[PDB]
Amino acid sequence: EFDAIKIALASPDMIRSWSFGEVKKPETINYRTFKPERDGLFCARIFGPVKDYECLCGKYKRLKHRGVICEKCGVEVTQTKVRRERMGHIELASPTAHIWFLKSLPSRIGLLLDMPLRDIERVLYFESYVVIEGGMTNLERQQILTEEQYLDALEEFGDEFDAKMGAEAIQALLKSMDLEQECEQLREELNETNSETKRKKLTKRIKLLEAFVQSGNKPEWMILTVLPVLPPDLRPLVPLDGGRFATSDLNDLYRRVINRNNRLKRLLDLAAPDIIVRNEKRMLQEAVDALLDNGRRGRAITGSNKRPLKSLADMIKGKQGRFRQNLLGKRVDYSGRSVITVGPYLRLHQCGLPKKMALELFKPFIYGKLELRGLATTIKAAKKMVEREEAVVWDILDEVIREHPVLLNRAPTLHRLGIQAFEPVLIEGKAIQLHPLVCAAYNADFDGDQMAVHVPLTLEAQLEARALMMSTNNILSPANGEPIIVPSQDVVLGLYYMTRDCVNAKGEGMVLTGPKEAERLYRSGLASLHARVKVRITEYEKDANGELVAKTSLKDTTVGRAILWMIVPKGLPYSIVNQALGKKAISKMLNTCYRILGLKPTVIFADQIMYTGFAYAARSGASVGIDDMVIPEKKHEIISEAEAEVAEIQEQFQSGLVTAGERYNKVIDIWAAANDRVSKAMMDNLQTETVINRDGQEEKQVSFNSIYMMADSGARGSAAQIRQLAGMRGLMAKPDGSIIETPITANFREGLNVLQYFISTHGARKGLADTALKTANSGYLTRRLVDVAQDLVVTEDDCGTHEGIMMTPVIEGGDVKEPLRDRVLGRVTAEDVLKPGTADILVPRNTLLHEQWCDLLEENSVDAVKVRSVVSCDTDFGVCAHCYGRDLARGHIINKGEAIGVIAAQSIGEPGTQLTMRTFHIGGAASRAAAESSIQVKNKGSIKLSNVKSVVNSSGKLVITSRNTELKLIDEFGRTKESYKVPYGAVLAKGDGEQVAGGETVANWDPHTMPVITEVSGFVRFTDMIDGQTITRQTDELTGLSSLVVLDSAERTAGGKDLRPALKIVDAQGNDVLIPGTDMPAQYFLPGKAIVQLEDGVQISSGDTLARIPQESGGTKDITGGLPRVADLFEARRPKEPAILAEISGIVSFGKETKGKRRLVITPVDGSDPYEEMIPKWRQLNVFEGERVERGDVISDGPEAPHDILRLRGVHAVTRYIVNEVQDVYRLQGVKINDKHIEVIVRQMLRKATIVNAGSSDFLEGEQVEYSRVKIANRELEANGKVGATYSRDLLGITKASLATESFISAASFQETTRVLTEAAVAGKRDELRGLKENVIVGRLIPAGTGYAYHQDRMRRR
Amino acid sequence: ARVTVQDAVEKIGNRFDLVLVAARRARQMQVGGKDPLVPEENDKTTVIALREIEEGLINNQILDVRERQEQQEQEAAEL
Amino acid sequence: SAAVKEFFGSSQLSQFMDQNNPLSEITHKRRISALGPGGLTRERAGFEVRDVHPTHYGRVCPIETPEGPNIGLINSLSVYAQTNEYGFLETPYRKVTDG
Amino acid sequence: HARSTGSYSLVTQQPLGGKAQFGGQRFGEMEVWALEAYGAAYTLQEMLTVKSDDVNGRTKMYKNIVDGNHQMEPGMPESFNVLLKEIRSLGINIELED
RNA sequence: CACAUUCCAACCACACCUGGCGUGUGGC
DNA sequence: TATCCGCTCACAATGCCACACGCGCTGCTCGGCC
DNA sequence: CCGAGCAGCTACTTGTGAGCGGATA
Ligand SMILES: [Mg+2]
Ligand SMILES: [Zn+2]
Ligand SMILES: [Zn+2]
């Protein structure tokens, strides 16, 4: 119906036009009579008739006098619904300011009037004058004064000098302010000045002035002269029991405001003293700006119960405003709620529903069907029959739910599967029967969980629920391609028992014709369930075409597998059943079934699987007992050996040989080894003692213990759980996070000691409270992520670009964390994938990577691939389908319209319930040092050096003169398998391209020594090194030869600051060595804290550590990789010590020492040094004054910052780092997430941009303009001969992206309501509601789902 | 009855246009007063619409052609 | 009188007992809270108050705690725990001589 | 507990909840996110205003359903108009275009 | 002359209710 | 006078459900159209 | 009279981000 929404300021004339009257009496209603007042807060002639088609005086009450007003009260007789929109006003006597524009931080007036907010507040609260219309006076026109500064200066000028002390003063200042003149003056000032903070203030002021002059607003409207009022019925006021009425806080606010206004009018009429009227004006200002936003001024006044009062701003902000409570999520009709219950008989596509619930939900459909047949002629008869619930209504209820699905919903909703569609079947009861195979996706246990049910109610809705939200249409999770219908513990335990074959049982060695005969023989009891029998199977194999070739063959399998074969469809082979059929086994079986046979038979296959599993687990009789859990007989001797070891360790400690730390470490490792040994013993015990004679002596087999069947099959029990159960619990934790030296030498089956149980519960309460605290942070993160999301949909089919990202399997740390396949599966290649064979186009561009495609790619041994990405897509206000990839829930390419952002945010926030908040895992919780630089290798390969800069020593090894050097292992096929960071001065015992085996160390480095190793042999001298000025002599004691110490910039006086100690590699003649290739003198300028043990004039070696500069290594820096880690990563917050990079290349030097901190200068050979920087004097310097490094290289060793990464490495490096970090954090826990989600998240995260040079564009250089907008403007300018612009992408934290959006309603729905509302109002912004959330807040179709096409049809109209 | 709609996704380009044309067919069958081209088995309008779509004789182009034809018939009768 | 009445009727600690079984009565009268005046708020509590200390041995139960919004803030007194004259938690112990 | 059509709040024409009063359930914000992650544009559009907020839409939908007409009318959410009037009560002017 | 309506055997219209907001407790 | 640093203020922290409960008193002073 | 407006009888969070001096070269 209507187009975009426009927001701007409210002119007083506009308010008066809105007003249908003025409230003057502060009374609402009367005590004896409930009729409203004449012109009070609740009026009739101002707002409307309190009753329908009935006036206040009762004169015009018929339906024929409607449309006219009365002669005494003058109330237009109409419906009371008109009271929902009619408003009045209050004529304020002393114009006041708006607390929103005054407490915005930064406030609008504080920046517009170039006046500090402190002085404006002083003027507003009537305690200091401000002058106006200076002119010929000596004072400045905008200067402020106090009472004394006014009384002493009044005698100088009293006719032309005037200074008001109210909001009228700033109102007149606004009215007496020019727009074009000030704009031109500030533009000239910005063009003439050269500063950073001043230029930022000037550009903010000029942007503010441009927003004023461009939009249809006027500054003087900020001073509220008339006050709009809230319609009466919208004001909460209802007759409570008795004379008291339930009122609202806004009622009291308006009451007090009207009272203070009337008192001020009375005081002005009697010509009260100046102090009295100024105090009354201050009180009226307090009243009005508490009505606007109570508590913002500082004093949160209370009305009743001594509680903070509710103002108008409170009704919008927070989790209780209109946006969060009444606009985004509203309560719906035709809904119900009930506790869940296991339904084991219903099919996967359907569900159960209580009879009374189904009756109460579908009352209109029942009424319609009763009126259809000759059963009920009116609605009253049908209602009475439904209330009576005769025998004639139940069949109607069964008919209306014949094919009418409903929606089941879990209370905490994480991903798309939080709401599913199901066909209901009526059941007698008060509980909702649910399918067992979907609750796992619901994450809903049956311990008392309550879920909700909703009705589609519309043909379109029913068809959508049957087509999209149905359970059958959702079998792959949107996060990972893994099927979310993986079987649960009961069915998998039943199947494992059915397939776990023994050695001897009833009917071992016989022959069976088919699976039906096997089932007959089993149910007859003449044979067992699991026994090796030779049967004949008749399997079917899918040929190249749609043919199913049949082959009959004699197999030797267990009776259980043969019986279960009657369930699997014909397409699958027999090798998938001829297994133990564990959890992973049945999961891969279902996956292969869905892959080969599609979706239609997979549903019934899973249903039959679940049915047979339940039936055979019931028939089996699986049960855990006391005798089932066995204790290892040799556990006692292991415990005694462990206690003897700890006793001898304590004896050694008492002997004074070993200290406390090493004693604790030895005790901990001894107990860990003992626990591992006893766990292995328990496992090998639980596996043995299962011997059965089959015409022999002993045929030891797989153990048939029930607890082992439950654990090994992966149904419910894991290895660690059964270890804690049967074996010793092991070690526990103390409050700080350390490990107590006294372990728990008992188990659960055996009696647990009191102190042991106390330590156990102390350790467990931490993990228990962990999730209870972390659920709130996870919900907050999900909300932030979805608010950043939902601003993009698939609006194009192709962008027409070729840029992407170089995806490669990460191999950092161990061998490999994940291959390339899973990182490219479901995507489209940008360029031609180059096989190791030169000039190969085996994978053409613009092609989707299917299963066979990635299989062939892995077969061809491809190391990396340039794959299309979302950050590279050029689609405006959305993304294209040709850049996202597969849907991850459908077996085809992504369609057009589906909101990728919402599903991405959901898939990212779902594992939040499985992450951690805080733990002792701080990276080096055990030990970490640079002495670990002894790098070994597992497999055999050739060595490859990245960033090659190294030389060879006289000892036979290779020394590295750089830090960015990287060691890689090329395998026999050509790919990389091992990657490691080569430290500075590593002892590379190998060479580049050399074939080395696995299991040997190739390099190593000193832990606490920064090497200044040379490059070529020569003679060393004390060049530019004078004793007593730059160095000191601290003699050694145990080394014979003493060490020359160098002081740092903290202890060295000013006498040696201009002298830097250096080392000059000279020859015997006197001339220094020349670096081979260049024409630069070879010298090493050593910084402070240098320990030079080498003498003078001695023949130095090629690459020998001369000055042993001690580093600050030995501490941990791995910030806890929990939910706070990913929160801070997405928020793009800077770490405590940000690892600074190199802005420009070239040499570096130190200039002005102690300019508050250390200084640095970067001078390249190409350009100048236009950028200075401050560096703390407590951070070590990796690069020295003589070393030349490329831009973007680390200087301060520590955690990096994403801002510098993006601004010095491009758009692809920063997103690669982000995705790698977040995937590592998620895989540390064990949860898998496709990279497309985080990719689109970061793409949305860098939506903003800035300008460097305006050029021919209309955007100023100091304006943070949107990326796609300036991009399309640059495109338009490229269509002509003018230069577009100089755009620079800047990264911000996720909370800032939801605010710096062209749509203001989308930001108003988020936090920070008042500031964004004021910013949109002052600029007269108008948003085209182009998105999803705004389309909800307005309440229309969404341009993402089935209605997206509708929106397209709306775009073709205009 | 109907349990899966994968074959419909095979026959139509995607799921959104599929559900749109199914809703159009359901509106034509329920309130439009049109007869189902496939004999029903005590099923609602949605199920028979999905079945007739799966049989391949009804889609968006066919529905537009039928709408144009009924319009032409209206005008021919108005003569 | 009004102050005493409002303290006994409406406060963060005055609450009607969960009269459903004697166990709830006993565990509610022996209930120690960290909320209310002079105490923390469950919204602004760190991981230190929630965790149980080895000094809680015999003075407050470490396994009885309402799981949810307040884990560790609401506890129950130990069986043999007594209130010290100064207002501390005292635990009985048998004196052990040489033999 | 369940509800077909009961009372509505006075501040805004929205269905109540709870079991004491004959009210439905609350379509939480996470539920809206999950719905818009799927398609079901018409489903959300009816669940938001036609079933909950439309002062003149829910009655029309009920009259159509009891008359065997499964067709809806979007209308406008009442709470949206409440927010409009609340922002208009402040010194800020919001306005819908053509 | 003209505009516009016109107030009374069953009954259609004259129906039915507190999450204002906070706190406390408990459960998932 | 630029510019980093220290102090100060705005804003943020699930979701549902169930139950229970609640709203400064008395007095004084000024003002309104059957 | 009635009604309505007003007067005497809080600090274990922590974090993050932005703004306002502020003092030092
Ligand atoms: Mg549960
Ligand atoms: Zn009247
Ligand atoms: Zn693209």
From Swiss-Prot, chain B:
Keywords: DNA-directed RNA polymerase, Nucleotidyltransferase, Transcription, Transferase. It is an enzyme of class 2 (transferase). InterPro entries: DNA-dir_RNA_pol_omega, Pol_omega/Rpo6/RPB6, RPB6/omega-like_sf. GO terms for cellular component: cytosol; cytosolic DNA-directed RNA polymerase complex; RNA polymerase complex; transcription elongation factor complex. It catalyses: RNA(n) + a ribonucleoside 5'-triphosphate = RNA(n+1) + diphosphate. Gene3D superfamilies: 3.90.940.10. Promotes RNA polymerase (RNAP) assembly. Latches the N- and C-terminal regions of the beta' subunit thereby facilitating its interaction with the beta and alpha subunits. Part of the processive rRNA transcription and antitermination complex (rrnTAC). The complex forms an RNA-chaperone ring around the RNA exit tunnel of RNAP. It supports rapid transcription and antitermination of rRNA operons, cotranscriptional rRNA folding, and annealing of distal rRNA regions to allow correct ribosome biogenesis. The RNAP catalytic core consists of 2 alpha, 1 beta, 1 beta' and 1 omega subunit. When a sigma factor is associated with the core the holoenzyme is formed, which can initiate transcription. The rRNA transcription and antitermination complex (rrnTAC) consists of RNAP, NusA, NusB, NusE (rpsJ), NusG, SubB, ribosomal protein S4, DNA and precursor rRNA; S4 is more flexible than other subunits. HAMAP family: RNApol_bact_RpoZ. This is DNA-directed RNA polymerase subunit omega. It comes from Escherichia coli (strain K12).
UniProtKB/Swiss-Prot annotation, chain D:
Disulfide bonds: none annotated. It comes from the Bacteria. Signal peptide: none annotated. DNA-dependent RNA polymerase catalyzes the transcription of DNA into RNA using the four ribonucleoside triphosphates as substrates. Belongs to the RNA polymerase beta chain family. The RNAP catalytic core consists of 2 alpha, 1 beta, 1 beta' and 1 omega subunit. When a sigma factor is associated with the core the holoenzyme is formed, which can initiate transcription. This is DNA-directed RNA polymerase subunit beta. It comes from Escherichia coli O157:H7. The chain holds residues 1244 to 1341 of 1342 of the full protein.
